[PDB]
Every structure is written in C-alpha cells, then in structure tokens.
Design a protein around this ligand. Structure first.
Ligand SMILES: CCCCC/C=C/C/C=C/C/C=C/C/C=C/CCCC(=O)O[C@@H](COC(=O)CCCCCCCCCCCCCCCCC)COP(=O)(O)O[C@@H]1[C@H](O)[C@H](O)[C@@H](OP(=O)(O)O)[C@H](OP(=O)(O)O)[C@H]1O
Ligand SMILES: Nc1ncnc2c1ncn2[C@@H]1O[C@H](COP(=O)(O)OP(=O)(O)NP(=O)(O)O)[C@@H](O)[C@H]1O
Ligand SMILES: [Ca+2]
Ligand SMILES: [Mg+2]
Length: 933
C-alpha cells in the first residue's frame, strides 16, 4: 500500500490518466487516507506527523562512504613512480640479506610519506565536498530547511524550481517541465490535471506555476532505482616519464662502466687466475655496484611531482573557500588561471540589485530630487499612490529592517519595491489602500511577463465603472497613451510631436544617467457598454500618463577596481543584460567595461541575430567571427542569446590564440551556456538550484570582485609546480653527473647509497611540502594569460638550473680532487671495501647537503626576482622543514657513524661547509644579472 500506488505512476501514459478515472477518483478522492492539510496550513506542533507517517523514511540518507582510509591508502599506493620505488626497495632488501637493510628502509620512509599524506587529502577533501551539499514547503509562513521532505506536504512550484520529489498536479497556470533527466527527451511536457498530472523528482520546471501534494515521495520510486541499482596533468606525466627514462639510461651506463672497469682491472690487466675460493668476495663487489644503480634510479625518478600537484590543488581549494568561492570541480581551479574572457550579466553581479527611485517627471515638471508632497498638485498624489499600491501585486512589501537600523528589506521584484519606496518617500502609505481592496473587488489582472513588459489591473470598485492602471516600460506604454494629466489635474491631448519632444527632453537624460524609465498611466471605461477585454491590443491604449519614474540600482563599490584588474591581466569583460541599450551603455561606462572614446561596439539582440545569420534560418560561425572581437555590451538579450555568444567565442579559429571563457550565468535558462563555458560561475544567494547544480564554482557573496581571486589563486597553482621543477630538476642533474664521474674516475661513486637516499628524501618528499604551499601574491595579476602550448620548463628556469648546476659541479669536483691538500685531512679516494669512513668524503657529503639546502631557499623565485627572502615568514612550513633538515643533517654527520658512512667533523670544517653554502646564495645573486635573451 505504501508503494503499491507507485505502480500507477510507472505507466507514464494515457493508461495512468484513465487509471485514476477508473477507481482512484482524483487526488482528493484518496487524500482522505491521511490529513495532508488540503486547503489549510500545518499548525507546526512538534509531534505532528508521527501518526500519519507511522514509518519514517527520508531520502536524505547518503551512502556510508565512497572509500575508507585503508582503501584510500591502497588506492594511493598504485602509482607508477611508487611501483618503481617499491620494486627498488624490495630488490635492495632481498640483496642485502644474502647494515645493508637501512638503504631499503630509507626508500620505504619515502613511500609511506608519499602515500599517507595523499590519502589524508583524499580523505578530507572528499569529506568537505560532501559536507557542503527554506524548502518548497508552502503554507502561511512555513519555511524549513531543505533536508527532510515528508509525505503530505503542500509544495508550491514556480518557474525554474527543481522538483525535490515526485507528485501529482492540483492547480496552476501553464506548467511546462523538462523531463530530459529521466526520459532523455528534451521536449517541454505540459502538465495538467486532465492530461498529465504526474510530476517526477529531478525534473526541471521551465514555464508556468502550480501546486502539488504527493504521489508517493520516497526512495522506493524511480528516483531510487538508479541509486540501488587536464592538460597540465598530462604534460606533467609526460615530463615524469621522460625524466624516468633518462635516469634509467644513466643508471645503466654507470653500472656497465663500473662492472667493466672492475672486470678489466682484476682479470685482464693483473693476469689474476680465477679461483673458486675468491667467488664469494667477488660477488660482494658486484652487489655493491648493483645497488648503486638502484639508488641512482631512486634519485632520478620524480616521485614528488604528483604529491606537489595534489598538495597545491588541495591547499588552493581550501584557501579559496575562505575567499567566498565554493569549488565543486577541482580542475576548474587551474583553468581559471588561463581565462581570457569573462561574460557577466548586469543585475546581481555588477549591481547591488537594490532599486530606489531617484528622478520623477510628475506634474509636467522634471524633479532631479524626490519632491515635497506639497509641491505636487492635489488629486494627482492620491491617484499615483492608489495606482502603485494596486499594481504592487500585493505580495511585495517594504519590511522593516529590525537589524541595527539597516536599510529596509525588499522581498518581491525590485521595480514594484522601488515604486513603493517612492510612495513612502512621498509621505503616503499604501497599506490602507491595499486593505480597502484586498483582492475582494479585483475584476481582472493581466499578469506581468517579459513579452509585454507591463501589467494591467482592472478595478470595479467605482459604481458601474472600470479603471485600468497598466504601468509599463516607458517605451511600449508611453506611445499608447493619448492624453496626459498635468498641471492641477488637467487632462490635455498628447500628440506625437509632444511625444518625441518629451522623449528627447526627459527620457534620454534618465537613460544616459544610468536609470531605468518606467511609465505610470490610467484609463477609465464608460458605464458598462461591453466587456471587450478579449483582445489586448484594443484595450491597452488611449491611456493617460500620470508620471515617469527613473529607477536605479547602485553599482557595487568594488567592481570598478576589479574590472580594472581583470583588464590589466589580459582578460576582457563583456556584459549581457536585458535592459535597453541606453541604460546598459550608461551602466557599463560607470563599471569601466567600455571606455568613453573607443571603437567598442554595443548592439541589441535583434540585430545580433539578424546580422550573425546569413540568408535562410541557419547560423554560421564565419559571420559570428566579425561581431565577437569588439562586442562589449549586449542589450535586450534573449535568454539564449548568451549561449550563442559563448559558443561563438569558444569555437573560433580566426584568432591565432585559443580563447578560454568564463560565464557568470545565474538562472534556470542559463543552463546550456553554463555548461558550454570552460569555467561557469553561479550566483549563490539568489541562485536557483538549477543553475547551481550545473555550475563549476559558486560565488557565495554573488560579487564580481571575488572572480578576480579565482584568477590569482589559479595562476599561483601553476607557479608552485614550476618552482618545484626548479629545485628537483637541478639536484637530480648534479648528483647524476657526480656519481657518473665517480664511475669513470676513482671507481668509487663519492656519495654512498645511504647518503644519496638522504638527498632523495630531502629533494623529493620534503621539497613538495616546502614549495607546494607558497601563499599567492597580487603580482600574479600582472602577466598576460599563459597559452596552452607553453613549455613546462621556461627559459629562466633552465638558466637557473644550468647556473646552479655549474657552480655545484665545479665546487664538488674541486673538493673531491684537491681536498687532501686544501684541508690537510689525508685522502679518502680509492678506499678498500669494508673500510672505516674518511673525513674527506664526509666533507663532500656535508657540502653537497648544505648547497642543496641553500638552493632550496634561493629557488623560490622563478621570475628572476633578486629579493629571494621576500615573504619567507608568510609560510610556516617551509622554515620548519628547512630547519629540521639542517638539524637532522647535523645529528647524522656528528653522532651517526658507520651505518651512514660518516665520521665526526670538527668545527672548522663545518664552518667552511656553511661558508660554501652561502656561496650558493652569492652565486644566485651573480647569475640573476645575466640576461636571458
Ligand atoms: C633537465 O633540464 O632535466 C634533466 C634530468 O636529468 C636526469 O634526471 C637524469 C638524466 C641525466 C641528464 C644529464 C647529463 C635532463 O633530462 P631531460 O633532458 O630529459 O629534461 C627535459 C625534459 O625531458 C623535457 O620534456 C625535454 O624537452 P622536449 O619535450 O621538448 O623534448 C628535454 O629532454 P629531451 O629533449 O631529451 O627529450 C629536457 O628539456
Ligand atoms: N513590475 C513591473 N511592471 C511593469 N513593467 C516592469 C516591471 N518590472 C520590470 N518592468 C519592465 O519590463 C522589463 C522586464 O525585464 P526584466 O527581466 O524584469 O528586467 P531587465 O532589466 O530588462 N532584465 P535583467 O537585467 O536580466 O533583469 C524591465 O526591463 C522594465 O522595463
Ligand atoms: Ca627521485
Ligand atoms: Mg529578460
């Protein structure tokens, strides 16, 4: 019974419609089973619906968890670089047992630090995105959070509302719903009691409005049937595989050279006969060679790059959440860095959406300020307030602020609220006028819509008389009026010459001042000759204009600076609005989108469609290629005309560089365009669920300036990866060269296995955390957007890599060769197998570590910036990582002995190594001078 009725709604056809007429009557026939408050409202008692809904079931129930922590660690364990590292560790541990174990431990100490942290991110972010994600419940004032939905509710459906649950249609006007989410057909189904009262969860309402109780709301319906049953990343992966291949080749060459050298020396040259008892010692040498190659591989493989990308993305998202940006698609964090065009709507985003009356043309006299009630003649003020109050639709009201004496809140549409505010400013009150006729004697109402741009109201209160007010848009209604009420209640004939003269004199200044012109009129019908209200053309004419009002929405305080920043950073801003061309241009001038004197083009939607379409109804992109390069303002735009623009920009090949666009579209009809744009923002506070569902990033404060932040952070992400590539790529060069030289000369590979693994831990794992959490700077907004074919390794990065590599190689080789004479500390070269560690090689290892540590500090400036120490303390992880590494290096060198192949060093050598380390900063300052070109 609780789910039996669902079978009916499964029919989806005329069979379902005839089923209710067979035995189920209507909705009211079976609603008797429960209370359901048919024509009344729920009292709101706490234990109310326990009796009706004996078993309580909510669709709010989510899945338990997509993954657990153990599963997340297992998932993160499967990466190519990590597979190579694990194989190398297994081989090292296997060969050692035949302190040889410690080397393997080092590798594992990397792998864990790579997986766990990553898993933690995938455990936290996945939670937060789940955490982020007033209801359709209707009554007297009943508005409750969206997360319960129960059977028997009275849902009021408006245009653009997303249906939260299935139901049956009671009453309404022209409800058209898109059911492509469940049927796959994008045709607008028209819902009615007689033909198709079925409503489905997840469908989007396109047109009309109405009411709904319930068909069967729950997961047992078709909703639960399904439930129960990156360019940057690719380039980084390609770079990683290239580096891995190069490292493998170098390791193979080094191993071959060492093995061949030893074999030629021991057998061919010395003529030593091979003896079986020497077989054990021999293989020891071989093992000591083989592990070296493995270590080189572990050095060359860039295991820290995926970690750096993950950390940068996660940190950027978590800090963007502070800047009023909710990120639903992670990749959209990066793409917004390369945005080169921003298409935005006027109302809401650029304007505060609070409309107040500033200018009026009452009594045939223009007033730039709201006039005193004494100045306006009698019998005109009363007519004006009556007309405004009656046309205010009786739902809009100026509610008292009640919050520290703030501005009064506006509930309904902004134009009627502005007119009501004008009435209040005239020291008149509309409440008694509304109470006199609270829809009691309201004869006929012409509902406002975007086509007519007006609304008419018929009052039969006068004795056997009809009065129609019919406020308009000052361009449709104004030309229809045939008389004008001016002076002391004098009605004079309005002629077309007077029409054009008053237009030019009065209407144009408001439009050029950024205001929107609204006309108020009224007309009286004789006694009762005929109710010829069937035709609208012959009834909406012969009006008498009372006054003309200019309504303005103030521009946001911070959007001019944001637009200036956007235009400075190479991003062009275009505005799409439904206002007339004059007001749109005047507002865009104040916003700074279009400069006063330029060749920018602003045209209406009608001529847009006419010009971009060559003969016949087809639309050609070749025509669109001419309009979009210099189209700044679009006025009287249709809901679809934005989409036609966005596509025209994205699929354009005439421009040498490709275009990445961001559309700040909010609204139900903005669904297609929002999906076409590379990054689609949606307004948060006033955004319908339809627009927010298909959005990439959500702006909580619905402000344009926050979009600028979405630029900066995005670019920051790129830079972070770049600087990591500046550090790792030099170290794995120098070491790979040094060891290779140690293969050709001294046959020793100066840096042992454990020391090279310590360097690997320094440069791969810890460096990702160190250089992947850099806070962003505003200077990132001072460069042109980066192309999508730009090389990952810029020219300055390679210059720095080569200069620092040259310095490091020179110092290391000079030390390795002449340190016996320089430090008078004896020679460590050509040391025999199983020999005590020498101080000469410990000096080399310590100097190498110190130079890498200072290269980490001086490698934070990719763009040739001289002041390296700029903003170090703004990052609290970099300093602690560097200092901890320094302390660990000290304790390893001093206390660590045979296992790490390091001997205690006196203070003099330590100070000289630190001075050589400071030499790295000196050399960086020197190399900053040399021009790149
Ligand atoms: C850096 O400057 O990195 C060192 C890494 O050293 C080792 O890690 C071990 C190897 C030791 C090297 C030497 C001595 C050299 O390795 P790399 O040469 O492969 O690094 C890049 C990268 O691979 C680009 O993607 C390629 O540019 P593109 O794609 O256009 O061709 C191009 O390499 P390539 O031309 O051979 O293919 C190089 O700029
Ligand atoms: N309550 C109203 N009664 C009569 N005319 C109205 C009313 N509200 C607005 N208008 C006029 O009719 C038009 C309807 O368009 P509307 O979508 O309300 O605003 P817009 O500014 O044109 N477009 P947009 O910027 O997207 O909000 C307005 O531009 C006014 O000229
Ligand atoms: Ca490595
Ligand atoms: Mg519109």
């Amino acid at each position: 019974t609780m789910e039996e009725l669902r079978s009916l709604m499964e029919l989806r056809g005329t069979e379902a419609v005839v089923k209710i007429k067979e035995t189920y009557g209507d909705t009211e026939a079976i609603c008797r089973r429960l209370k359901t408050s048919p024509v009344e409202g729920l009292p709101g008692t706490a234990p109310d619906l326990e009796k009706r809904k004996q078993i309580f079931g909510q669709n709010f129930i989510p899945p338990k968890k997509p993954k657990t922590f153990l599963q997340l660690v297992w998932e993160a364990l499967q990466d190519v670089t990590l597979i190579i590292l694990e194989i190398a560790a297994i081989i090292s541990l296997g060969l050692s047992f035949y302190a040889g174990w410690i080397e393997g431990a080092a590798i594992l100490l990397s792998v864990i630090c790579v997986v766990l942290v990553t898993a933690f991110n995938d455990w936290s972010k996945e939670k937060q995105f789940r955490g982020l994600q007033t209801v359709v419940r209707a009554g007297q004032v009943v508005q409750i959070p969206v997360a319960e939905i129960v059977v028997g509710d009275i849902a009021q459906i408006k245009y653009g509302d997303l249906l939260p649950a299935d139901g049956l249609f009671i009453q309404g006007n022209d409800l058209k719903i898109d059911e492509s989410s469940l049927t796959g057909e994008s045709d607008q189904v028209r819902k009615s009691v007689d033909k198709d009262p079925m409503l489905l969860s997840g469908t989007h309402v396109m047109e009309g409005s109405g009411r709904m109780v319930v068909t069967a709301v729950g997961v047992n319906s078709q909703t639960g049937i399904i439930f129960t049953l990156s360019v940057l990343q690719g380039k980084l992966t390609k770079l990683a595989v290239q580096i891995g291949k190069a490292g493998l080749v170098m390791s193979a060459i080094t191993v071959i050279i060492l093995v061949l050298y030893f074999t030629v020396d021991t057998f061919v040259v010395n003529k030593k006969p091979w003896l079986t008892e020497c077989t054990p010692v021999y293989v020891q040498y071989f093992v000591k060679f083989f592990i070296i190659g493995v270590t080189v591989l572990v050095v060359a493989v860039p295991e820290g790059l995926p970690l750096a990308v993950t950390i940068s993305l996660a940190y950027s998202v978590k800090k963007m959440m502070k800047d009023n940006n909710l990120v639903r698609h992670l990749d959209a964090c990066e793409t917004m860095g390369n945005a080169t065009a921003i298409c935005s709507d006027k109302t809401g985003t650029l304007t505060t959406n609070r409309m107040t009356v500033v200018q009026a043309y009452v009594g045939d006299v223009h007033y730039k300020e709201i006039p005193d009630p004494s100045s306006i003649n009698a019998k005109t003020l009363e007519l004006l307030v009556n007309a405004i109050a009656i046309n205010s639709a009786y739902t809009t009201k100026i509610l008292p602020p009640e919050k520290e004496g703030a501005l009064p809140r506006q509930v309904g549409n902004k134009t009627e609220c502005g007119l009501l505010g004008f009435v209040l400013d005239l020291r008149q009150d509309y409440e008694p006028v509304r109470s006199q006729m609270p829809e009691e004697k309201l004869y006929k109402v012409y509902t406002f819509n975007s086509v007519r741009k007006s609304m008419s109201t018929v009052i039969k209160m006068p004795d056997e008389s009809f009065r129609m007010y019919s406020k308009g848009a000052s361009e449709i209604v104004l030309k229809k009026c045939c008389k004008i009420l001016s002076g002391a209640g004098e009605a004079r004939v309005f002629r077309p010459r007077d029409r054009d003269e008053m237009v030019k004199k009065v209407i144009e200044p408001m439009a050029c001042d950024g205001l929107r012109t609204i006309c108020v009129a009224y007309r009286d019908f004789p006694s009762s000759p005929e109710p010829d209200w069937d035709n609208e053309n012959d009834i909406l004419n012969e009006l008498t204009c009372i006054c003309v009002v200019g309504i303005e929405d103030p521009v946001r305080p911070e959007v001019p600076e944001a637009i200036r920043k956007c235009q400075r950073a190479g991003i062009t801003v275009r505005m799409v609005t439904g206002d007339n061309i004059n007001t749109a241009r005047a507002i865009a001038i104040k916003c700074g989108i279009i400069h006063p004197g330029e060749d920018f083009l602003c045209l209406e939607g009608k001529e847009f469609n006419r010009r971009i379409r060559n003969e016949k109804g087809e639309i050609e992109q070749e025509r669109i290629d001419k309009i979009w390069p210099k189209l700044r303002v679009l006025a009287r735009s249709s809901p679809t005309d934005k989409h036609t623009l966005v596509k025209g920009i994205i699929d354009s090949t005439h421009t040498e560089q490709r275009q990445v666009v961001a559309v700040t579209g909010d609204g139900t009809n903005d669904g297609p365009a929002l999906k076409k744009a590379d990054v689609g923002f949606a307004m948060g506070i006033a955004g319908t669920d339809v627009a927010k569902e298909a959005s990439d990033i959500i702006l909580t404060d619905d402000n344009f300036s926050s979009i600028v932040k979405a630029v900066m952070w995005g670019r920051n992400v790129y830079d972070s990866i770049s600087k990591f590539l500046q550090f790792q790529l030099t170290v794995n060069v120098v070491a790979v060269i040094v060891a290779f030289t140690g293969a050709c000369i001294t046959q020793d590979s100066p840096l042992k296995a454990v020391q090279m693994l310590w360097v690997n831990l320094i440069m791969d794992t810890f460096a990702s955390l160190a250089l992947a959490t850099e806070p962003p700077t505003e200077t990132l907004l001072l460069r042109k957007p980066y192309g999508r074919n730009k090389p990952l390794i810029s020219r300055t990065m390679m210059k720095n890599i080569l200069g620092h590599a040259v310095y490091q190689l020179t110092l290391i080789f000079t030390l390795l060769f002449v340190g016996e004479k320089m430090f008078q500390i004896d020679s460590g070269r050509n040391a025999p197998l199983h020999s005590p560690p020498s101080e000469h090689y410990t000096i080399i290892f310590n100097t190498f570590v110190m130079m890498q540590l200072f290269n980490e500090i001086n490698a934070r400036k990719i763009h040739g910036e001289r002041n390296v120490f700029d903003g170090i303390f703004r990052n609290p992880i970099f300093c602690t990582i560097v200092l901890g590494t320094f302390a660990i290096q000290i304790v390893i060198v001093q206390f660590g002995g045979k296992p790490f192949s390091c001997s205690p060093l006196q203070l003099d050598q330590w100070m000289w190594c630190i001075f050589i380390g400071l030499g790295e900063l000196v050399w960086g300052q020197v190399i900053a001078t040399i021009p790149t070109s």
